[PDB]
Amino acid sequence: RTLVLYDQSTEPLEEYSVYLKDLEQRNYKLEYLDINSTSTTVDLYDKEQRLFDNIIVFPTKGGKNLARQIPVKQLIKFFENEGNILCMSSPGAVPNTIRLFLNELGIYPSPKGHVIRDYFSPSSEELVVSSNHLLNKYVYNARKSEDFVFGESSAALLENREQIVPILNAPRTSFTESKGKCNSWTSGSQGFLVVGFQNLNNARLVWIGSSDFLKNKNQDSNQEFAKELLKWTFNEKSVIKSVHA
Amino acid sequence: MITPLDVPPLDYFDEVFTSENWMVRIYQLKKDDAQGRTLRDVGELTRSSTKTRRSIKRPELGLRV
Amino acid sequence: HVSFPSTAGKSRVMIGKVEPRIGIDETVPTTITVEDPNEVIQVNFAIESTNKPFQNTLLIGLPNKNLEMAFEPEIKDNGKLSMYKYRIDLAKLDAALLQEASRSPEPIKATLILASSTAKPKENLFREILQLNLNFDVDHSDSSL
Ligand SMILES: *[C@@H]1O[C@H](CO)[C@@H](O)[C@H](O)[C@H]1NC(C)=O
Numbered sequence: 001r002t003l004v005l006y007d008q009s010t011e012p013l014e015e016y017s018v019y020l021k022d023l024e025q026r027n028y029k030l031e032y033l034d035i036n037s038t039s040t041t042v043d044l045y046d047k048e049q050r051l052f053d054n055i056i057v058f059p060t061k062g063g064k065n066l067a068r069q070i071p072v073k074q075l076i077k078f079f080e081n082e083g084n085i086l087c088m089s090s091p092g093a094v095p096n097t098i099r100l101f102l103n104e105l106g107i108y109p110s111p112k113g114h115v116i117r118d119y120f121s122p123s124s125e126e127l128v129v130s131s132n133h134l135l136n137k138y139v140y141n142a143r144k145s146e147d148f149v150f151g152e153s154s155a156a157l158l159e160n161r162e163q164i165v166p167i168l169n170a171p172r173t174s175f176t177e178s179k180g181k182c183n184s185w186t187s188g189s190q191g192f193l194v195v196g197f198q199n200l201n202n203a204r205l206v207w208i209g210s211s212d213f214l215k216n217k218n219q220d221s222n223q224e225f226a227k228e229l230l231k232w233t234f235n236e237k238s239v240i241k242s243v244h245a
Numbered sequence: 246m247i248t249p250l251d252v253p254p255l256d257y258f259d260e261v262f263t264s265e266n267w268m269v270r271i272y273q274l275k276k277d278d279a280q281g282r283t284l285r286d287v288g289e290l291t292r293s294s295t296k297t298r299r300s301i302k303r304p305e306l307g308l309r310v
Numbered sequence: 311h312v313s314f315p316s317t318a319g320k321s322r323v324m325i326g327k328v329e330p331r332i333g334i335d336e337t338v339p340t341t342i343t344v345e346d347p348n349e350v351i352q353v354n355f356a357i358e359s360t361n362k363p364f365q366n367t368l369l370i371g372l373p374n375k376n377l378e379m380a381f382e383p384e385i386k387d388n389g390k391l392s393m394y395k396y397r398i399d400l401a402k403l404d405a406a407l408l409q410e411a412s413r414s415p416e417p418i419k420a421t422l423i424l425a426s427s428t429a430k431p432k433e434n435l436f437r438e439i440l441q442l443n444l445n446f447d448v449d450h451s452d453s454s455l
Contacts (some may be wrong), residue, residue, distance in 0.1 A: 100298070106280075185303055190378070
């Protein structure tokens with residue numbers, strides 16, 4: 001079922017154990033692959049039959065190890081066949097394979113070195129985002145006020161398609177600060193942090209623009225949102241059936 | 246005289262039948278992309294040979310509703 | 311070098327009634343608001359006080375609908391005071407913003423942000439300058455917005 005891909009160079013697998021365990025706790029046959037010191041390549045398809053139902057791409061730096069296991073064309077062929085994806089692109093860990101796959105789906109994430117900065121921050125240390133910026137009840141509806149710890153993060157520019165499901169918004173004051181002199185990638189509340197996609201085939205993708213959102217350290221702040229997010233991504237939360245028209 | 250470069254590719258229709266002497270030709274409308282992108286873009290993707298992208302440049306796309 | 315703000319709002323038709331109609335969150339607010347009657351550039355002046363303007367941005371949209379645009383300024387440093395000018399073209403505005411404003415009665419509003427990382431908390435500026443009430447009935451019936 002689920003396939004987990006991770007790089008032990010950028011972020012170890014243990015830091016994201018809680019949520020994976022919860023998956024195990026609900027009968028998720030996780031198969032774990034590491035891309036740092038592996039040569040064999042996973043074959044998503046065996047004679048035109050996909051071997052997995054979902055896939056998780058934990059934070060990885062761009063390299064030729066990712067471009068070999070999940071090339072863009074294989075990702076699009078998996079996605080057209082109803083596979084569900086869960087990407088994660090922190091600043092300083094944005095692969096070109098994810099970035100290009102998501103530029104094909106309409107979502108334009110900021111590239112490396114573009115870090116969102118908010119000066120009207122609750123806590124100056126890291127980018128905490130309140131729960132008022134949630135933009136879809138079906139994905140997740142907060143009953144009470146929550147402050148999500150997002151760490152260093154990036155933003156996404158969204159096209160005007162029917163398939164894109166925005167989920168969270170950057171703070172209205174917040175802006176991206178590129179190390180270079182290029183203008184801000186996103187300026188205000190037009191940069192999205194969490195984003196989702198649903199095909200016409202009902203396959204679902206979700207992009208989280210931080211690497212610290214799903215870490216064990218921030219478990220208490222971000223457990224309800226994270227668990228409902230993963231349930232939505234895997235077609236387990238808000239699926240609808242029409243009967244007997 | 247018709248040369249191979251006088252005929253641009255068809256990105257929205259498939260050939261399904263062509264009679265024996267090429268007198269009747271039947272094409273079929275292909276269903277739109279699941280990802281909701283124009284079929285010309287799918288084509289120009291499946292044709293353009295693999296090469297490094299020109300650069301990473303902020304897209305001019307407008308305002309998200 | 312303290313700053314003097316001018317919002318040169320270039321127009322296309324019956325612009326509106328820029329005005330700070332109701333009392334708002336007054337965190338280091340604008341010292342005063344003003345206007346001029348010139349047709350080509352109905353510039354609006356306001357000499358507000360920033361603390362450090364590393365972030366200097368004017369958002370001309372509807373905050374509730376999340377439709378906002380970010381307008382950078384133009385800084386001229388005389389050496390005693392710095393002059394900021396934001397030039398807004400009513401014609402070159404997002405189609406969705408125009409349509410949303412026309413379809414439902416509400417005023418397009420302009421919020422100013424001046425801030426810095428090194429600034430003390432509560433010394434940054436995030437305040438609504440004006441609320442234009444557009445009147446030109448010129449909107450397209452059908453568009454992809
Ligand atoms: C895989 O392991 C480490 C991560 O701990 C990585 O830095 C290295 O490049 C790889 N190879 C070896 C031998 O560690």
